[PDB]
Structures are given as C-alpha cells and as structure tokens.
Design a protein around this ligand. Structure first.
Ligand SMILES: *O([C]1[C]([O])[C]([C]OP([O])(=O)OP(=O)([O-])O[C][C]2O[C]([N+]3=[C][C]=[C]C(C([N])=O)=[C]3)[C]([O])[C]2[O])O[C]1N1[C]=NC2=C1N=[C]N=C2[N])P([O])([O])=O
Ligand SMILES: NC(=O)c1ccc[n+]([C@@H]2O[C@H](COP(=O)([O-])OP(=O)(O)OC[C@H]3O[C@@H](n4cnc5c(N)ncnc54)[C@H](OP(=O)(O)O)[C@@H]3O)[C@@H](O)[C@H]2O)c1
Lengths: 364, 364
C-alpha cells in the first residue's frame, strides 16, 4: 500500500484559511486490469486553481469523502506532471516510467499520488523517449507540468480567432510578464507576428524588457505608456512602418489597461479577455465600439476544448514538438520541493502567497 | 462492549459523494431498564433513503455527534430487520433472538447494531416462532427487512380510500413492475379486484406481462398503449364486460402516465399519488375534474401511520399472515453481505449505484 497526501478543502474560501492535508491509502498491489497508479513529479499554482478554491470559478471537482474524510472535501489543482509507476494487465497505452498529464480538468493535482484509468491521462514523451526518437531536446519537469493550460491558451488565442498576416500584422497584450504573456511572445516570434507587450513598471524594468524582447515581443511598453495619449502616435508609427495592422488585443488585466490596448487596435479590431488580474471590469470607450467597429469577446481554454479533442491534441502536439526542437522555452517557475517535513498544503499556501514573485511549481 | 459500524453523512449530497463509515461503541454491559440492543440482519436501499441523504426529503434524522463524530452527522436508512441480542431489566415485550423492525421512521438502519428502547421496535415472528405456531412458512430476511413500507403502502391504497366491489371493480396503476406495483397486483388477486397495470416497454415485455398476470394483474399495457387514442376503446370494452367500474388510480410516475390512467377511470374516480419519476408533475385534464367528478390526492405511509398505531398493526398483521400462509411473495433482492473486509458505506454506495439491477438489500 502507498501512503499518499492530498491538499483538500471542505469549504470554499481563501487558500490560507481553508486548505489542509489529508493522508490517504492507495492499493498498489493487485491492480484492476485498466487501472494506472501515478506519482506526482510536479504541479503548478495557476490563478484558476486559486479561484476554484475561492468558489468564484464555475468548473470544480465534487466534494466527496473519497479521500477518507468524514466531511465532503474537494482536491485542488487542475494541471500537473505525473510518472506512471504501475499499470494493470490490460493497459498497453502506458507503462512504468512514462510521463503523463491529466486528460481532463478537476483531477486534483496538488497531491503526491493518484489511482485512475489510462483514459484519465495523456502521455507526454519523457526525456529518454525524446532522445531515442531522435530529438535534440527532451522536456524538463517544469515544461511538462505547465504544458497543458498556458501554452495552449496563448496558441489558441493567437491562431483561432483572427488571422494575422505573417511578417506584417500585430497583436497587443497586457500582463506581458505573465506565463501566458511569455508563451504568446514566443509563439508570436515563431509564427512571425509582430507584438506589443504591456507590463507594469518596476525597478528592474530594463532587465524585464530585455527578457521579453528575447522571447519575441517586438516592443515592450509600460502601463503608463499604455495610458498615454502623447505616446499613441509612436505606436502608430511602428505599425505603419511594418505595413501591417494591429488586429488583435489580449487582455488579462481589465480596467484602464484594457482601455489602453483596445485603443491601439486598427479599425475592426478584436479583443479577447482571458483574465482579470485586478478585480477591475473590462472598460472600453463608447467611441471604439461605434466609430472604430471594435469587438470585445472572451476566451476560456477549458470551455473551448470541452468538445474539441482534435483541437486540443493538435495544439498540445505543436507545443511538444517545439520543445523537442528547442524552439520554445518555458515560462520559468520558482520550484518548492515537498520532502515530508512541512505539510503539503503549506507548500501550496506559500505558493499562493508568493504568486507576485512569479509562477510557482511544487515539486516532488 | 460492541464495536459497531454506521453509515453516516455530515452534509447532504449524492450518496456516492457524502457517505462514510463510522466505528462506534455500544456498551452491552450498561443497558438501562427499558433499553434493548439489536444486531442488524438486513436493510434495503429505498428511493426515500437516497432522497433523505440528498436533502430533498422533508422527514430525516437529526445530525448529531452521538456516533462519536467531530462534526454533526446523520445516519441513513428507514427500513430494516434486526435481531434482539440483549434486553434491559424492565423489558418484557422483547427477548433475545426475537426479530424486530423499527417502530418509527428515521431510525438509521444502514448500520450493524443499534441501542434503543423497547418501544423503538415492533416484534415480527422469527421463522422458529412461525413454525412453532403451526404456520407453513416463516418470514425470510428479505421479507422482514422490506415489510414496513411497500406492502403496507399497496394494501392501504387498495383498501383505506375507496371500496372496490369484489368480482367486478377495477383499479389501474402505473409503475407496474415496482415493488409496490407487484404487491398491489397480488393484493388485488387476494381481494378479487380487477386491475390494469401500466408499464414501460422493454425488451422482455411479453415475459414481464405474463409475470404480472401470474401475480394478479388482470391486464397489463405499455405506456404507449396508455397514451393511445386508438387503444382506449379496448380498455372500455374490458371494463364494460366485467359489469364493474374503474374507481381507483394509483400513480407513482406523474406526467403523461398520470394523465393516461386518470382518463381510464369511470365517473367518481379517485387517484392516489404515492411517487413521482423525473420530477414530472401530476397532469390531469380539466374536463375530468369538472365533468367526471374526479379527485386527485396523495398517499404517504409515513404520515398516515404517524398517529395511527392500530391501523399500522392491523395492516402489518395481515401482511405477516399472508407471508406465513404463502399467499404473498416479495420480489428477489440482490443481497450484499457485510463481513468487515470492505467498509460498510461502500456496500451501500454500490447498492445505490446499482439500483437499476433490482432492489438492493445489505445483509449481515
Ligand atoms: O504583472 C502581473 C503579471 O503579468 C500577471 C500574472 O502572471 P502569472 O504568471 O502569475 O499568471 P498566468 O498563469 O500567466 O495567468 C494569469 C492570468 O491569465 C488568466 N488565464 C490564464 C490562462 C487561461 C485562462 C482562460 N481564460 O483560458 C485565464 C488568469 O485568470 C489570470 O488572470 O498579472 C499581472 N498583474 C497582477 N496584478 C495586476 C497585474 N496587471 C495590472 N494590474 C494589476 N493589479 P507583474 O509582472 O507582477 O507586474
Ligand atoms: N408515498 C409513499 O407512501 C411511498 C411509499 C412507497 C413508495 N413510494 C414511491 O414509489 C416509488 C418506488 O417504490 P418501490 O420501492 O416500489 O421502487 P422500485 O421497486 O425500485 O420500482 C421503481 C419503479 O419506477 C419505475 N420508473 C423508473 N423511472 C421511471 C420513469 N422515468 N418513468 C416511468 N416509470 C419509471 C420503474 O420501472 P422499470 O421497471 O421499467 O425500470 C419501477 O416500476 C417511488 O416513486 C417512491 O417515492 C412512495
């Protein structure tokens, strides 16, 4: 028998208040024929995971007593990389040593182990398999553990809604230092799209601007520049020189930031709102709608891919291939290793509290 | 001392999610004068038990800490057969070895043992007692465990409301393959009432028709036939040939099915609704109320027998006698035995999930 740990809550609220660790038992002897046991290698903290715990995210796992609690409790985390440790006698899709992610949301990835079927998982090539299949690179644990939400989100927003002419057209995005922002910049570079990333000013501004330009942002501006009527004509010059148009805006901030990036689009522009990193609503001047034919819409990768498994597979395959080819790198995570001395839920609580420092990955 | 197990929940929800098993101690060396300890022999899973756990049934046991839980918890199950194992110094009505059912609802029968007062139980004859009293049969465990709700429901609906003339009048009922339905057909035969059972179509329709007819249904029709304008005159022919009238409809379905059985009654008809599938409301054409003196009412055995021990006693005694005489038969339960190797709540969760296979009885 394996003794596992899961991060659970019995009631919605802030992670600092409601999370605890539950020890539970998994039977790793005498597997059913289709069953698969996996050990976690790592799982990140994404905003969606936190919103799920807070109760403001309408897709969530059921509260159950299945982890051996008396009160119904929900697990946490939708994304993660797991190593297959044992498979049942009718399992050929997976074997010991294989890398997998969950095939569906609401799996509960903030935990040490899981028992499911082979259809609960999607296989990723492990480094040994990538090299054997003649690839110059294999995935890292961070790359595998964060492959499923943010890279697909960036890829689909940039490709699935409006067609940007390679070598000419632009997108503009706020939250430029976000993991999603960093994938968008790289995917923009790979597809030959011009882009403007908007970021908050900070003391190490120059270092950040350089990182983002290296990733693929054509220009990086601050939110102060975004707000600036004086600066607008400079952006117009860039776009005019390119021969192209700013056709797409990606908004994960809301408020004034959403106003600023919308104003920078050419007529007939599209904005996709995929997040709201301050509680501020999407705010658009009436004149953009009426006089510039602006359109504002939403994006939600979970809903988009629900009955679109071909689209999911195709997108994921492209990200894997790019990683194997050395053409894509990961939005880097701050890693915290679980080793048994500090309760698992506290690692995640610290991760939630240190969100501002950057993407957090709990490792195992 | 006795280490017992109870199936409990701290919060309402689906049985698959909220049930757990709680160990608790009964001190069998510390009985008060009027107290009795019983060992469960068997308890079924009925829809009302499930609705209770889900939180949509307005009669339910209180949540308490009495089973030694940290948080308040409620037990499950309303019906069951128990064996008296020990009685207090002032108990005369029961002795060790006796068979009993709960005297009242909300007792919590999904558990191994209970401590209660002598008046929390009603004695049934055990097989040794039936045999000693000159009876050709004694009750089976399934018969005793399911005697409290369904048989009594059928008998009272048939006899307590409208007086059917033996050898000529008719009742019509839907849910004809239900436990209640099957008891009603038998009681109809025993009292010489004609009846029409309405059932859903199924692959072995003809085989089921024949079984229901053997039980006592005069005629059996599908829901399609119940709906059918074409078929309706055939039913009128049956009733006219008998010299009697259709005076009573028993409804456990609602919706179109309820409309159809109501339309088949003669003037001055009474419908009793005792259940309802798919949340479909009871739907009765206005014309029947106005022009055919139709009445529609409810039946709930829990409420009818709440303050009427004498009617309960007389009815229960008739059912017992019929079992002893070999005049009534139960539908075959699927029995799952608790031996202490699989948690008790999981046996009941399986039974809930497997409801469609047949009535589920957990035995001990
Ligand atoms: O500015 C902040 C960061 O740029 C950014 C957050 O970065 P992150 O890496 O921690 O978060 P990500 O995992 O990339 O994603 C966060 C947002 O995107 C939404 N999202 C992601 C994927 C899929 C969906 C979807 N709909 O399919 C949605 C998610 O809900 C998040 O909203 O935020 C910036 N930030 C923080 N506070 C800000 C702010 N910008 C402006 N104003 C305020 N108050 P930094 O680098 O710290 O300065
Ligand atoms: N008010 C009361 O005093 C009281 C007391 C006892 C029972 N009841 C009611 O009676 C019913 C269950 O009694 P039971 O223990 O006899 O149950 P049961 O043995 O499990 O039988 C259930 C019946 O419901 C039928 N059914 C299921 N879904 C249906 C649907 N969608 N449309 C039409 N019929 C459907 C089944 O038909 P199939 O065989 O085709 O699947 C079967 O005949 C419940 O509605 C319950 O609330 C009420």
């Amino acid at each position: 028998m394996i003794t596992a740990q899961a991060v659970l809550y019995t009631q919605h609220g802030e992670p600092k208040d409601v999370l605890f660790t539950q020890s539970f038992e998994i039977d790793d002897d005498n597997l059913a024929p289709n069953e698969v046991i996996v050990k976690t290698l790592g799982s990140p903290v994404n905003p969606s995971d936190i919103n799920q715990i807070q109760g403001v995210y309408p897709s969530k796992p059921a509260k159950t007593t299945g982890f051996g609690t008396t009160e119904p409790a929900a697990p946490c985390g939708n994304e993660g990389l797991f190593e297959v440790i044992k498979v049942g006698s009718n399992v050929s899709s997976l074997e010991a040593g294989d890398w997998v992610i969950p095939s569906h949301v609401n799996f509960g990835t903030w935990r040490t182990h899981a028992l499911g079927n082979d259809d609960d998982f999607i296989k990723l090539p492990n480094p040994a398999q990538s090299k054997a299949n003649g690839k110059p690179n294999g995935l890292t644990i961070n790359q595998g553990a964060t492959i499923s939400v943010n890279p697909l989100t960036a890829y689909l927003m940039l490709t699935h809604y409006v067609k940007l002419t390679p070598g000419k057209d632009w997108f503009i995005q706020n939250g430029g230092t976000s993991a999603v922002g960093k994938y968008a910049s790289q995917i923009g570079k790979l597809l030959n799209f011009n882009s403007i990333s908007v970021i908050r000013d900070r003391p190490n501004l120059d270092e950040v601007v350089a990182s983002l330009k290296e990733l693929g942002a054509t220009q990086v501006i601050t939110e102060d520049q975004n707000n600036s009527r004086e600066f607008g004509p400079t952006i117009k010059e860039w776009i005019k020189q390119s021969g192209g148009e700013a056709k797409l805006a990606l908004n994960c901030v809301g408020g004034k930031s959403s106003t600023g990036i919308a104003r920078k689009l050419n007529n007939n522009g599209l904005m996709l709102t995929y997040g709201g990193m301050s509680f501020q609503p999407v705010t658009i001047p009436t004149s953009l709608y009426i006089f510039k034919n602006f359109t504002s819409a939403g994006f939600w990768v979970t809903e988009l891919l629900k009955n679109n498994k071909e689209l999911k597979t195709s997108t994921l395959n492209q990200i894997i291939a790019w990683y194997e080819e050395g053409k894509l790198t990961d939005a880097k995570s701050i890693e915290t290793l679980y080793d048994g001395t500090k309760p698992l839920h506290e690692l995640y609580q610290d991760g939630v509290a240190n969100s501002k420092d950057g993407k957090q990955l709990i490792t195992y």
